[PDB]
Design a protein around this ligand. Structure first.
Ligand SMILES: *[C@@H]1O[C@H](CO)[C@@H](O)[C@H](O)[C@H]1NC(C)=O
Ligand SMILES: *[C@@H]1O[C@H](CO)[C@@H](O)[C@H](O)[C@H]1NC(C)=O
Ligand SMILES: *[C@@H]1O[C@H](CO)[C@@H](O)[C@H](O)[C@H]1NC(C)=O
Ligand SMILES: [Cl-]
Ligand SMILES: [Cl-]
Length: 443
């Protein structure tokens, strides 16, 4: 028995009390009023009466998750003027308890997720002059609670994810000037009004994944601080030129699981902080994306297009490239790769490459993986693989290799000496013999 505590709870030396999972039906008695954190989650507190926390006026953290809480008296949380964190997720609240939280003027974090909230009273959040994080995810909201959110200029993170929001009107978040993170994933958003995000000048993260967007949202043009954008698993068919004109600081764009058939040639131009670009199955794309000003790209994947040409300045403009996958397009001519000193992984399988020019592989000192399978290569220049000191694995098979001597001399001898590196077998057109097995006559 702890004299400075109270059974069945547990107390530490820093005024933190753990009374979680003890079958409690009420707020514990016998504890110090100077208690700073109270964890009473995972109990059986189905209701909080008037004066519930009368003995905890100095409380800073309160965890009430995983009870089956369905009612909070308007006066249950009276006196909690030091409360910074309130945790209410995984309960049976049907409405936002606006009355009960009105006097919580020090509150910085409010978790209301995983309840069954269908409505937000128009006066919700009015007293929360310090709120920084608001979780309203995993409920049954059918709209953005516009007027309640107008009360929170200090808010930095908001989630309205896993609800049933179908549209967002003009100026829905306009008072949220401190907002940095906005989650709207797993709703049914089909309509974003032209000015729905106006006022969110500090927003760095927007998550629109798993929605029902068709037209690409022009509304994101009002997001100058945007660094991370997710709109994967929607119904977007085209990413137009100018799409990211308002977002020069974008580092991350998740755009997969969309029926993307076309992307504008300049859609990803002038994005100096963009780290990676992965676009697959945009079948109507014919020209290589204009990436002028997009100089910090470390990874690029472009597959399933009609692209037949790669710009010669690729390894100049995109010098930081570590990973390059341009497989399953229609490429015939390759650029020089000399400027790509950081390139570790290259995939060019299933194109129409018929030649490599001499001395275009000399700068590839970091190259570990080289995939040239399923092309139209009959030959390579002598000493093409000379400078590939980091090379681990190479694919050369499914090419019509001309095994005439002395044309095949270098490659046959290279593949023999470097047999551990070759994956599958480059074979001679006609005879079907492995290229490594050919010994050309010598002087
Ligand atoms: C929770 O409290 C209710 C009402 O007092 C009670 O009927 C129920 O048995 C409790 N649930 C438990 C102990 O799991
Ligand atoms: C929110 O911003 C609008 C438009 O700028 C303004 O009219 C209104 O006063 C603000 N609402 C507040 C501070 O509650
Ligand atoms: C792109 O951005 C850079 C830096 O802000 C600027 O130099 C250029 O004028 C912009 N527009 C272009 C290249 O069309
Ligand atoms: Cl449930
Ligand atoms: Cl990557």
């Amino acid at each position: 028995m702890d004299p400075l505590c109270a059974a069945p709870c547990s107390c530490d030396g820093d005024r933190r009390v753990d009374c979680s999972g003890k079958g409690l039906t009420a707020v514990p008695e016998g504890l110090s009023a100077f208690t700073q954190a109270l964890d009473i989650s995972m109990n059986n507190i189905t209701q909080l009466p008037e004066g519930a926390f009368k003995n905890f006026p100095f409380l800073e953290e309160l965890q009430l998750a995983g009870n089956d809480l369905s009612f909070i008296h308007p006066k249950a949380l009276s006196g909690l003027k030091e409360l910074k964190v309130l945790t209410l997720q995984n309960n049976q609240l049907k409405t936002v308890p606006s009355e009960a939280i009105r006097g919580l003027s020090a509150l910085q974090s409010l978790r209301l997720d995983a309840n069954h909230i269908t409505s937000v009273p128009e006066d919700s959040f009015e007293g929360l002059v310090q709120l920084r994080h608001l979780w309203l995810d995993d409920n049954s909201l059918t709209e953005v609670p516009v007027h309640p959110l107008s009360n929170l200029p200090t808010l930095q993170a908001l989630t309205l994810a896993l609800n049933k929001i179908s549209s967002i009107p003009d100026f829905a978040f306009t008072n949220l000037s401190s907002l940095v993170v906005l989650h709207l994933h797993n709703n049914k958003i089909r309509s974003l009004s032209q000015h729905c995000f106006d006022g969110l000048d500090n927003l760095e993260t927007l998550d629109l994944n798993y929605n029902n967007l068709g037209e690409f949202p022009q509304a994101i043009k009002a997001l100058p601080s945007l660094k991370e954008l997710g709109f994967h698993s929607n119904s977007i068919s085209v990413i137009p030129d100018g799409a990211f004109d308002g977002n020069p600081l974008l580092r991350t764009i998740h755009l997969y699981d969309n029926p993307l058939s076309f992307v504008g040639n300049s859609a990803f131009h002038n994005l100096s902080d963009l780290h990676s670009l992965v676009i697959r199955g945009a079948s109507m794309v014919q020209q290589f994306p204009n990436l002028t000003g997009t100089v910090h790209l470390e990874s690029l994947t472009l597959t399933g297009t009609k692209i037949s040409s790669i710009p010669n300045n690729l390894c100049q403009e995109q010098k930081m490239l570590r990973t390059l996958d341009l497989s399953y397009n229609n490429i015939r001519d390759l650029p020089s790769f000399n400027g790509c000193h950081a390139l570790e992984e290259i995939s060019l399988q299933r194109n129409q490459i018929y030649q490599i020019k001499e001395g275009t592989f000399q700068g590839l000192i970091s190259l570990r993986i080289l995939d040239l399978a399923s092309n139209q290569l009959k030959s390579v220049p002598d000493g093409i693989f000379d400078r590939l000191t980091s090379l681990q694995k190479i694919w050369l098979h499914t090419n019509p290799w001309d095994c005439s001597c002395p044309r095949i001399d270098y490659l046959s001898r290279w593949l023999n000496k470097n047999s551990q590196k070759e994956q599958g077998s480059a074979k001679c057109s006609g005879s079907g013999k492995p290229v490594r097995s050919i010994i050309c006559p010598t002087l």
